[PDB]
């Protein structure tokens, strides 16, 4: 029935920034304090920053600042590092023992551009007798997210038999990596010679190209 | 001071699920616990708290499906009833302080899948790259594993670098758009002596067993040598088409660098005798060249049987092939139908129906392929293969699990084929036989010691009487289920009676009755009492006690 | 009164397949325009000659034309089958003394081999390729039921049987 | 004291001839000269006698057509007129004390002939035997000329030897049956040194001229006129019978003594251009090795033209020649060719082959079926059977008996059948294997009463790691052959490692076994010893 | 017109023997002897035995007996020689200057028996240029002159392609000697591996072969 509106859900500001995260509550919280504000990333548990809609949690640093009463509260994140880019929640809880999150907020932070690390690797001789054929281009360690990844087999471009894997934002450069799988058949790999990978970066001035040679390794 | 979360799997829609919060550290008469879920790309959702006291409460939306209890003193069990695909979540479990869920320690999250896709295995190949492209100042290369085709969600890999340090990057999962289930890789870069270093990735599955674990163990490198090319050739007919009275068949190797090379001669595909053949190498300069020769009756080359030479070469393995040659090539697609094998039945209690459908001419396109019911009932998600064969052919494998209550009450499947370059689809049709049934009778014997013999014995097993003619023959040695391929099994015939009537026979080595003399023939089929399976023993040391 | 004539003269033909259905009789009335009706219903064909490309299932069943005459024309039936063997015929009823050619066709011009033809269960006649028995007359012993066996692209496949009878000449 | 006849020549029909006998010793005025002919083949013959008066006096068939004449005090001439071939003979003439031919001083006699061919001179070979025939001791050696193709005679034929002593013979003349021209041989013994000795004979035909001399200068020993083995071998199409874009055709000489060799590629018998293929040559101990490839289109490899492989070593030709092959089936038709049962061969000692033709058409014009063998020796009669099949097909069925020993020693049986609607002959050819041997082991078992089935039993009998695959089994019950239709036997399946192995299977009623309670499970199998067969008995008995 | 018969045309007895020669004319000759008996081998002049019907010539041996008168003659040969092998002829002088030969009658002896001595001879190279190739067989020094000699062409009996000569009797041992010369075309030669000749003989006990294969000498 009650609600947790959390506005933003999405915010961008650079290294040193600050940002603002609201949540706005339909009814007031038991005892006009008693919400939480949490830090997520991808793969992990929640880590609480503020408990209490204004006390900082223990190992939180002090750049998390909490406020707000009633049914209004803000947390605000100041001097913001490449650490603190996650997706940040609140907690509300009622009476009648009722706990409702928040919608949650993807914060996005602007650092420095790094170039990709390319690599390709060609597929198994253990997946060769499987009828399969994956071909992996690796793009290791590139800051920022955008990047283009295309498939040259015998000079040809392919479509709709590549995917792509991207990981998290890093917890200490914050950088990226990205791979993309050329899946192919047993014919479809055997008929051609030259698989090549190029990849396209802000980064780079030009695209990249990692190749090689089926049979001539 | 921690928590756990365990019980997290793949189960079907409507299933019951409990889940297990383990902690550690704290007691849970001071501290109550939460449960908290969170579906994929969705963000964070209470479900509810159990307080010291044994209180449960939950959120709105539970509506009675939640439940919480306190098995013991350490563990919080959760249990959810009437699920559907909206609950594929990772669950946390967490200590709280107070009815509030404000709290600081959390366990890392166990993950439920609700879906209708078969639980596979993943298959994990080396990801290494080309040593050529790979500099020879490396100080630090990065490598991989890819555990590619499982499902469902997840597998984790380890790492074994031996002594050398390694940082391990595991990429998410990517879902197939084919198939539907998931693929990973996971990157190791270690740095120092990497060449002469024996990598092994750990990935382990748990939707599969607990227990499933592959190790797959490689070395970083993919130069080999400078390739071989292997061609065919043959004996001409004469001057009036004839064909002479044997024919020969020269396998040739070109030049590569030299190295322990084998030719093996398949007719097709099974492994030949290698007295027929010979064999030569020469080497010229820095290379080396590789003759085989094969000679055959005229009646085998007029038999329209494939041979393939197959060359072993540093590891890797080379191919060609050939048949009797023809001007022109008809062949239409055929298609068969198999019954489930009484031990999927009845031991395994997993039968299945497989659609063969071979021969046909790789057109443009994929061909159509359906399972149904007579009766209307839903049929199970069927597998598929496509493999191009070494004649020519595209050969097509549709393996469908079929209800094991279902085909003993005598239900029907088809098997329906449809082409757009067909005249007509292709039907088949299978069924539980209609007729009675009589039960194996099983006698099991031993050839006797001779000249010759002292290390290698023949064992023979005799399955008779039987009704209906689908019968499964497996022998049994201290304790394991010996391969299929270790033995060899006639096709059924008619008795002069009544019954239908197998052989099997099986080769057996001297270190296995030493290790154990008792072998087991056993028959799996439907009419034998009470279990559908019969079996006896058999000693091979069956001593000779003269006038008893 | 018009007859109707088809060209191919085959009654059965294959999914997929053309005919041109022509329609003539008698110049007593100069001919204008023709009715066509596959089952009864009227089509929306003027012209003499009517075309049926690319044959569905719904193409079956029977046909008829008529002129500006009085009268209308005989119930020609057209079956289309989708299958490996065809053994098609020239007509369905026959008075003696006319050709009758008997073809076991197979399906997009592909090659028949091994071909046998039945009549009545025995075998009338076999030949390594696909072959055109041509019997220009027509005993009243030769009324049956025919059938024929065949390879196709090495498989064998059997014809749907049809049933041919024969007629005295005179009543 | 002798005489001596001239003037014998070949003359053609009409042309008058004049011989010239020659005396020495005694005197005219003294003596008579008879003339006296013999035909080749009959008997003597005379024609006349001259006195020392002049006067000649002739036979009764001569007619005025024969003339003597004396000439000088030491020659006689006789002139002889309208002649024909009957007066081919050769002419003596003699030394009469009388007017009878009673006399014992006779010329040698000249050969007059009467032909019409042409006049051909002899074409000379040496005639030496092979040398590693020749033994290496050989204390004497015989060697010879052919001197053939000529017309008329004669040849005469001398003899170089070098420093020995040495015997000639020179063997009388033989007329060519097709071309009517005459061949001799001339042979030559020696002894010692007659490895390195170089030996000649002199060949000369006074009919085409008088100074026709053909010395004919070898040697009895060399090197073995070489012969080096060509082969053809081809290119594959694929695994789905298809042809690749070009032919490769390799032909080899393997295994000769080194010498000058040149390749040459024909297509339907013309010489195609050099650069076309490549030859290369190795050499391995003694023996040489010589290989050529070609490289053809698809299109003309599909032409059905005839590529031939000529080799010429040491100026000599050795052939071989190809074609697109014939697939077996020209109309659709197949043909089966056996080979016989073992226990046909071995135990019956009847051993036959059938050839078994099917789908043809019921046509008109019977098929034409014929038998034979790769080296020619002859064949039996068949079985010749026809019969039409229940769905409209004819197929026609032969059995020929065959030889037990033949079939062992690995000849090859070939059946040929002609139809007069197939394009061509088809062709099925059967022989004995070329893998190893490996006799058959037998192991024969009763199977344990079953509760229930007190009246019947099962025996079981395993034959296993045989080479080749061509079995017989029996089994036998009171020293008879129980009907093959009592017992099911699988067909020939390989084993894990060398060989094959069937099963056989026995049903049995309480009557047999308490008739007689062994029964035998034999084997015939070619690789069995000593007479290609070996069985196991076995009861349903126990210990006790 | 007057006839002169001889008889018999063959006559054989062995070595010691006597053989008896008969002529009868159907008119009597001159002074009722004059009558020749003659010896002639192959490729000789004959020889003259007897003289006036009773006379023995000069030379002759004592062995040889003419006897007869008016129309019948004889000649005896008593004490039979290997060498006395040869064709007989008688001689008839009449009236009118008239003089007639006999028939003539071929007397043959038997003598101890020689096993032939086989040789094979394959064609000379200078023939194989000439598209024929004649394959010799040769017989040496053999007793009594009947012998068959039989070819084989890939064990196949050869017939109507070869043809023998035979030489007449020696003068010192008696013997004779036989060639038999097989004659075939240069594409029926090239077709053929294994060349074959079998002498079957009296003094054999088996027809001895002797073969050889094409090349290998
Ligand atoms: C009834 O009888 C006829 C026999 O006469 C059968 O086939 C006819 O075939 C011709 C040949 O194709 C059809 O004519 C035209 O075909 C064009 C394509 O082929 C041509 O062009 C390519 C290059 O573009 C060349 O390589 C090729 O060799 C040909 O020269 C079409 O583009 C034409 O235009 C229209 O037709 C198509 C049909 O799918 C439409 O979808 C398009 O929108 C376009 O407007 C043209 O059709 C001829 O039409 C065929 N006849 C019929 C009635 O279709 C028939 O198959 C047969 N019917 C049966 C067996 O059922
Ligand atoms: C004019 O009148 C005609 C006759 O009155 C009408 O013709 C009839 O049309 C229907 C539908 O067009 C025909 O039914 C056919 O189609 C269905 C579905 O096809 C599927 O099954 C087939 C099995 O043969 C497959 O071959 C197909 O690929 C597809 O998968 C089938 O149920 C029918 O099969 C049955 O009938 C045939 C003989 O026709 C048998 O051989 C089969 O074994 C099975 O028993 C048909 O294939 C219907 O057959 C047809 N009537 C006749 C007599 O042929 C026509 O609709 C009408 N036209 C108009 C415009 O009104
Ligand atoms: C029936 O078969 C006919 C084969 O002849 C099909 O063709 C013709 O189609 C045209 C246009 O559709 C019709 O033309 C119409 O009628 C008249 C006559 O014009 C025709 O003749 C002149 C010469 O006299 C010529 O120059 C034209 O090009 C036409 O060929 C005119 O008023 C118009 O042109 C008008 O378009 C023809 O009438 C028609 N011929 C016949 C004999 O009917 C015709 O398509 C088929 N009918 C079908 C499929 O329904
Ligand atoms: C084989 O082929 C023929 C055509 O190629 C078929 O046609 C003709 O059929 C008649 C049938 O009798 C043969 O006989 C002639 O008959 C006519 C007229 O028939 C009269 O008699 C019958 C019998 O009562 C009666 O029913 C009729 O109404 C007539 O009154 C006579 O005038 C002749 O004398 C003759 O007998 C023809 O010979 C035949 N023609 C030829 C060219 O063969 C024939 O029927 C076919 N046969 C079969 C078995 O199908
Ligand atoms: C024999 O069976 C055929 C069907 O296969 C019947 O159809 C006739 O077949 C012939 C030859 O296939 C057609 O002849 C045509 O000749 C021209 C000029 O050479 C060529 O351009 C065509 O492609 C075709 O070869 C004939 O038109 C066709 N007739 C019909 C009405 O379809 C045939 O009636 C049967 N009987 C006989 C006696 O041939
Ligand atoms: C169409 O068929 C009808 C069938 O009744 C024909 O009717 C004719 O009617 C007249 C008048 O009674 C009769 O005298 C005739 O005997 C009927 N039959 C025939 C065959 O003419 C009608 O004429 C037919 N139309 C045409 C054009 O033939
Ligand atoms: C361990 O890693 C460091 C980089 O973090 C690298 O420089 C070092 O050489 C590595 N040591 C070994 C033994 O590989
Ligand atoms: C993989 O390696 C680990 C590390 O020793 C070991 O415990 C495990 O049993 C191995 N698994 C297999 C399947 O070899
Ligand atoms: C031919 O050989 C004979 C035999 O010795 C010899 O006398 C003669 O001179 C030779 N001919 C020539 C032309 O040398
Ligand atoms: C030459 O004469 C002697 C004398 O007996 C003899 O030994 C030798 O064999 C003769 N040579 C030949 C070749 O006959």
Sequence with gaps: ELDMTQTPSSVSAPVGGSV????????????????????????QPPKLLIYRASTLASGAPSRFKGSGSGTQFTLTISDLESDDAATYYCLGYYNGVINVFGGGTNVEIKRTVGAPSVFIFPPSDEQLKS????????????????????????????????????????????????????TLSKADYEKHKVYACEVTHQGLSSPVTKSFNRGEC | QSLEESGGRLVTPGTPLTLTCTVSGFSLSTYNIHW?????????????????????????????????????????????????????????????????????????????????ASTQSPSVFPLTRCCKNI????????????????????????????????????????????????????????????????????????????????????????????PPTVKILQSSCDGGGHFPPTIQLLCLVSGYTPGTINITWLEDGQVMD???????????????????????????????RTYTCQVTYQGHTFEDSTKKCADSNPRGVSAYLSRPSPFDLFIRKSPTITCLVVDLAPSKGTVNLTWSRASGKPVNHSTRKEEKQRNGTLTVTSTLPVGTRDWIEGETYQCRVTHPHLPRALMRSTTKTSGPRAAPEVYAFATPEWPGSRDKRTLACLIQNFMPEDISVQWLHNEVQLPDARHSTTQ?????????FVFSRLEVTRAEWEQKDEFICRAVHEAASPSQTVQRAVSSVNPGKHHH | ???????????????????????????????????????????????????????????????????????????????????????????????????????????????????????????????????NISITNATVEDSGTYYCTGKVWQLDYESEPLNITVIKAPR
């Excluded at chain 1, 603002?20 to 793969?43: E, F, R």
């Excluded at chain 2, 289930?181 to 607990?210: D, E, N």
Aim: contains cysteine.
């Design chain 3, 1 to 131: 009164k018009p007859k109707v004539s088809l060209n191919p003269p085959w009654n059965r033909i294959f999914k997929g397949e053309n005919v041109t259905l022509t329609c003539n009789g008698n110049n007593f009335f100069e001919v204008s325009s023709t009715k066509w009706f596959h089952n009864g219903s009227l089509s929306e064909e003027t012209n003499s000659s009517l075309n049926i490309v690319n044959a569905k299932f719904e193409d079956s069943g029977e046909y008829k034309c008529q002129h500006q005459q009085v009268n209308e024309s005989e119930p020609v039936y057209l079956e289309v089958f989708s299958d490996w063997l065809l053994l098609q015929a020239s007509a369905e009823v026959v008075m003696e003394g006319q050709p009758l050619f008997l073809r076991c066709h197979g399906w997009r011009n592909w090659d028949v081999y091994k071909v046998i033809y039945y009549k009545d269960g025995e075998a009338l006649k076999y030949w390594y390729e696909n072959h």
């Design chain 2, 274 to 304: 290698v007295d027929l053949s010979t064999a030569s190498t020469t080497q010229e300069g820095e290379l080396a060249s590789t003759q085989s020769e094969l000679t055959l009756s005229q009646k085998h080359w007029l038999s329209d």
């Design chain 1, 131 to 182: 009828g399969t054929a994956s071909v992996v281009c690796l793009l290791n360690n590139f800051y920022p997210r955008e990047a283009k990844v295309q498939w040259k087999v015998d000079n040809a471009l392919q479509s709709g038999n590549s995917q792509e894997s991207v990981t998290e934002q890093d917890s200490k450069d914050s950088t990226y990596s990205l791979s993309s799988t050329l």
């Design chain 1, 20 to 43: 603002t995260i609201n949540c706005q509550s339909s009814q007031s919280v038991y005892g006009n304090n008693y919400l939480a504000w949490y830090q997520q990333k991808a793969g």
């Design chain 2, 492 to 500: 059924p015939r008619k008795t002069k009676g009544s019954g239908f």
């Design chain 2, 135 to 226: 500099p020879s100042n490396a100080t630090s290369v990065t490598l991989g594993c890819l555990a590619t085709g499982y499902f469902p969600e997840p597998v984790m890999v380890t790492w074994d670098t031996g002594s050398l340090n390694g940082t391990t990057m595991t990429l998410p999962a990517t879902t197939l758009t084919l198939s539907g289930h998931y693929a990973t890789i996971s990157l190791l870069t270690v740095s120092g002596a990497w060449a002469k270093q024996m990598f092994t990735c750990r990935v382990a599955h748990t939707p599969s067993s607990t227990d499933w674990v592959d190790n797959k163990t490689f070395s970083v490198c993919s130069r080999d040598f400078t």
């Design chain 2, 36 to 116: 908290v879920r969170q579906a994929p790309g969705k963000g964070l959702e209470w479900i509810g708290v159990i307080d010291t006291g044994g209180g449960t409460y939950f959120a709105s939306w539970a509506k009675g499906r939640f439940a919480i209890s306190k098995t013991s003193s350490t563990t919080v069990d959760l249990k959810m009833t009437s699920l559907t695909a909206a609950d594929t979540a990772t669950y946390f479990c967490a200590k709280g302080f107070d009815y509030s869920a404000s709290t600081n320690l959390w366990g890392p999250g166990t993950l439920v899948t609700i879906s209708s």
